Q: What sequence folds into this?
């Protein structure tokens, strides 16, 4: 979720 | 200590192993992520689905699986075993 939002 | 790896040995496998349980898990982990990446690239022009194409700075023409393995190295993914 963290990296997904950071995309 | 690990000297600068090159080509197919980068990232170091032994560092990837701690991010999984067994070598086989890493195989399928990376392969599924690579299918996701290739699918993003292949159908980027249209309405991409839940495929999150690259997450780590992609190479100019980095092969999909290489991007995937690097992502796994940087702890940018999660997995649920069978």
A:
């Amino acid at each position: 979720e963290e990296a997904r939002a950071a995309a | 200590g690990y000297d600068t790896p090159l080509g197919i040995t980068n990232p170091p496998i032994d560092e990837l192993l701690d991010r999984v349980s067994s070598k086989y898990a890493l195989v399928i982990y990376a392969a599924k992520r690579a299918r996701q990446i290739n699918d993003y690239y292949n159908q980027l022009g249209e309405g991409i689905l839940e495929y999150v194409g690259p997450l780590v700075e992609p190479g100019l023409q980095e092969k999909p699986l290489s991007i995937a393995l690097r992502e796994i190295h940087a702890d940018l993914l999660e997995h649920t075993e069978g």
